[PDB]
Amino acid sequence: ETFRTLLAKAALGNGISSTAYDTAWVAKLGQLDDELSDLALNWLCERQLPDGSWGAEFPFCYEDRLLSTLAAMISLTSNKHRRRRAAQVEKGLLALKNLTSDATVGFELIAPTLMAEAARLGLAICLGELVGVREQKLRKLGGSKINKHITAAFSVELAGQDGVGMLDVDNLQETNGSVKYSPSASAYFALHVKPGDKRALAYISSIIQAGDGGAPAFYQAEIFEIVWSLWNLSRTDIDLSDPEIVRTYLPYLDHVEQHWVRGRGVGWTGNSTLEDCDTTSVAYDVLSKFGRSPDIGAVLQFEDADWFRTYFHEVGPSISTNVHVLGALKQAGYDKCHPRVRKVLEFIRSSKEPGRFCWRDKWHRSAYYTTAHLICAASNYDDALCSDAIGWILNTQRPDGSWGFFDGQATAEETAYCIQALAHWQRHSGTSLSAQISRAGGWLSQHCEPPYAPLWIAKTLYCSATVVKAAILSALRLVDESN
């Protein structure tokens, strides 16, 4: 595996592994497509966790386990063949009860609808106050309906079986027949909004036919995977101003630029209705280092009073979105004294975890993702903060050289991010960190093979293998650079 072959894969935008949650939703379509749901049900039966739950085996995440188990248990029980899967249901009932007796996307709005549906099937009972929380947040639609231009459409299934009235029925589906490129949102749509919709089903059918029987969090996502794969590449000692390097990765830079709307930016896939600051800030960073002259106005349109927004019309902030912006601002040539640089740092500083020198972003579960990228982003802006962040990375390194932020287990992805940050600091400060990079590289080269832990946050946890591989290759080559 090389960056050349990895960017080729990134262009497909299919590096995101299937999730139990999106697969469970496909499994509820049995009365619409018999073969389709049966494949998804088999995926669920193969991927049920040893404790009876569905979701990521590691790391444990209550929201991830609850929504995946609720969705899976509902699909198994609604299916006309439930008697063949009684052993999975009984095991899931015990796990589901143990679970029931805002970390993920749409959790507060989706959980109450799956809790109610599970109860209707006799799977669960009912601090179930998310019912009122959902009412409150929905009322902020102001009588408007959900459609393609609202981030909630990614979680459109929060409407539930009896919420179709508040959806723009003919304004949810996109060019590929999907609702916001979410297999779960599309399965919901094809089941309760436009029952048997051929295009929503065709969208889902293509994923199940092409993949392993399951469904990923997002599909496709070629801009996200290209932009993040190039970002990790740029961490290595490679001259991106070299014409051959520009021409080797030219087709991917062109793809991002071609779908770049000036003044607005880019989404996860070319046809995406909505641009986001997270993708746009990293894409800006990447394009500029490759010798392009991209449009910084596409980042600034997300600027708000106290932080940068992730979505234009949303208010809630994110750490890494603002860390990405800080990177985009540094690459754009901003001064360390600039009000935009200072406002971003003020946001980051005031949202640091207490005691630790780390950040939890809620777009990625690992503090090493955000902390490592903060170190790279804040260089020449707040080197005091970066020194403290490095100190935390060095202090939390495991005896075998690896890093991990959950349940006492290491991850190749988290180790790769720490290597990137250590190598960056070494170049910037002159501090010799070769001993720690060397130990990490020794461990990383023995544990760099998939499957990878799903540390990315959507409605549940997911993994983009293409991006993680890019992070690992980048880290492995950085190790070689330090001998």
How many alpha carbons lie under 13 Å from residue 337 in its C-beta half-sphere? 0
Amino acid at 22: D
Spatial separation of the C-alpha atoms in residues 421 and 367, rounded to whole Å:
13
- Measure the CA angle with vertex 243, ends 239 and 244; round to 5°: 85
Which residues does residue 307 pair with via DSSP β-bridges, in sequence order? none
- Provide the 3-class DSSP secondary structure of residue 16: strand
Nearest CA among 477, 479, 469 for reference residue 225: 469
Give the chain's end-to-end CA distance (angstroms, integer).
Answer: 21
Q: Which fold has domain 3-216?
A: Glycosyltransferase (1.50.10)
- Provide the 3-class DSSP secondary structure of residue 456: strand
Tell me which H or E stretch contains 216: strand 215-216
What count of other Cβ atoms lies within 10 Å of the Cβ of residue 178? 27
Phi, psi torsion values for 16, nearest 5 degrees: -80, 125
Amino acid at 32: L
Q: Cis peptide before 59, with omega less than 30 degrees from 0?
A: yes
Compute the Cα dihedral for 109, 115, 117, 118 and give only its sign.
positive
Q: Is 397 left (phi over 0), alpha (psi -120 to 50) or beta?
A: beta
Task: Please say whether the beta carbons of 23 and 44 come within 8 A.
Answer: yes
Spatial separation of the C-alpha atoms in residues 341 and 327, rounded to whole Å:
10
Spatial separation of the C-alpha atoms in residues 226 and 252, rounded to whole Å:
7
Helix ranges (H only) for 234-382 are 243-248, 250-258, 277-289, 297-300, 319-331, 339-350, 367-378
- Provide the 3-class DSSP secondary structure of residue 430: coil
Q: What is the DSSP letter of 308?
A: B
Specify the length of the chain in residues: 483
Phi, psi torsion values for 364, nearest 5 degrees: -145, 140
Name every residue whose Cβ is closer than 8 Å to that of residue 129 and which is 6 or more positions away in sequence: none
Kindly report each contact of residues 76-83 with a partner whose C-beta sits within 8 Å and lies 24 or more positions away, as own/partner.
76/27, 76/41, 76/44, 77/121, 77/123, 78/28, 78/30, 78/121, 79/27, 79/28, 79/30, 79/37, 79/41, 80/30, 80/31, 81/30, 81/38, 81/41
Nearest CA among 458, 479, 459, 404 for reference residue 224: 458
Amino acid at 98: N
Tell me the CA distances in angstroms from 427 to 286, 375, 402, one per residue in order.
19, 12, 21
Spatial separation of the C-alpha atoms in residues 481 and 464, rounded to whole Å:
26
Resolution in A: 2.7
Token pair belonging to 395? 């202090």
Token pair belonging to 314? 């949303």
How would you label 26-57 residue by residue, b for 16+ Cβ within 10 Å and e otherwise? bbbbbebbeebbebbbebbeebbbebbbbbbe
Q: Cis peptide before 294, with omega less than 30 degrees from 0?
A: no
How are the residues of the chain apportioned to helix, strand and coil, as percentages rounded to the nearest 5?
Answer: 55, 5, 40
Token pair belonging to 410? 């290491």
Task: Please say whether the beta carbons of 457 and 155 come within 8 A.
Answer: no
- Provide the 3-class DSSP secondary structure of residue 58: coil
Token pair belonging to 299? 């980042």
Helix ranges (H only) for 433-483 are 434-444, 465-481
Judged on CB neighbours under 10 Å (0-12, 13-18, 19+), 134 is buried
